[PDB]
Symmetry: C2
Subunit: 176 residues, 2 copies
C-alpha cells in the first residue's frame, strides 16, 4: 500500500462511477484492505481528492508532452488539442478532479501552461499575445471537450472534424 496505489484506485473509481463515488470505504473495499491503514498515507477524503487532482493533471500533462513530441507549430497544436480532448473522453472523473479549488492541484498544472507557451512562441507573437494565446488554447480544448461530454453538440457533423476545424482556425489566426 502506497499513496500512489490509493490514488490510482481513486482514479478508476472516479472514471467508472463518478468522482463523488470516491470514499475511503470504497477505496479500502476495492484495495481489499482495512480502512484505518489508509491513514498512514492520506489524512482523509479531502486529502484523497487533492492527490487525485494532482495525479490527474500530471497524467494529462504526460499525454500532452507525448503528443507534441518532435512536432512543431501546426502539427504540435493539432496533436495537443486532439490529445487534450481524448483525455477528457476517456478519463471524465480524473479530468473533473483537476478542477478542485486547491492551490497544489492548480500548481501541478504549470507544466501544461509551459508546454503550450513553448509551442506558441514558435509563432513569433507580440507583447503579451503568447500569454493570451495559452488562455485561448486552454479555452478551446476545455470548451470543446466540455460541450461534447454534456451532449451539447447535437448536429450530425463529425466531432473529430469539428475539433480539427476549430484548431486550424485558431492556428490560421495566429499566423496572421
Amino acid at each position: 500500500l502506497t499513496l500512489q496505489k490509493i490514488v490510482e484506485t481513486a482514479a478508476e473509481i472516479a472514471d467508472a462511477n463518478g468522482v463523488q463515488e470516491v470514499t475511503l470505504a470504497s477505496l479500502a473495499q476495492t484495495l481489499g484492505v482495512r480502512s484505518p491503514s489508509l491513514y498512514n498515507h492520506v489524512k482523509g477524503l479531502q486529502d484523497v481528492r487533492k492527490n487525485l487532482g494532482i495525479y490527474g493533471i500530471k497524467k494529462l500533462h504526460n499525454r500532452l508532452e507525448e503528443a507534441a513530441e518532435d512536432k512543431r507549430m501546426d502539427e504540435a497544436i493539432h496533436a495537443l488539442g486532439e490529445a487534450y480532448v481524448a483525455f477528457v473522453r476517456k478519463h471524465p472523473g480524473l479530468y473533473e478532479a483537476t478542477f478542485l479549488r486547491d492551490e497544489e492541484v492548480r500548481k501541478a498544472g504549470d507544466g501544461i501552461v509551459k508546454l503550450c507557451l513553448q509551442v506558441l512562441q514558435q509563432y513569433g507573437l507580440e507583447g503579451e499575445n503568447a500569454l493570451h494565446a495559452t488562455r485561448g488554447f486552454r479555452s478551446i480544448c476545455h470548451g470543446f471537450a466540455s460541450i461534447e461530454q454534456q451532449g451539447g453538440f447535437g448536429l450530425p457533423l463529425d466531432l473529430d472534424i469539428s475539433l480539427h476545424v476549430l484548431l486550424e482556425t485558431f492556428i490560421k489566426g495566429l499566423r496572421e
Copy 2:
C-alpha cells in the same frame, strides 16, 4: 400572485444561481415558495419537468442577451458583442447556464435560436453550409470554455480577462477571414 408554472421556474432559477442546479428539488421549491408539494403538481409533472422548463427558460434568457448584443452589428462588431454577452450571462447566471445543458429535445430545440444567430453572423464572413456549421461549434466552444474556466478560477495569469477573451475572439475572426 396565484401560483403558476412561470413562478415555479423563476424560483428554480434563483435557487440554481445561488446554490447550483443540484439544489433544485421539489422539496427546496416547496419550502422557498412557502407552499406544499401537491400544489406544485397542479403546474408541473415533477422534477424532470421543472428541470426541462428551467433549461428552456435559461436558454431563452441567454438567447435574448445575445440577440440584443448583436442588434445592428455585423461581422467583427457582432462577434465581439456576442462573445462578451455570452460570458457575461455565465458570470451573472452560473446555475441557469448549467441548466441549459439538460439532455432534452425541448431544451435543445429552444437552443436552435442561438445556433441560428451565430450561423447568420458567421455567414457574413462568406462561410457556407457545413463549414459554417463547424464554425458555430468553434464559437460556442470558445465562449463556453473561456467562461467555464473563469468560473472555476482556472485563469491564474496576471492578465486582464476582458483582454484575453477578446484577443481570442480576434484570433478566431482572423482565422475565418
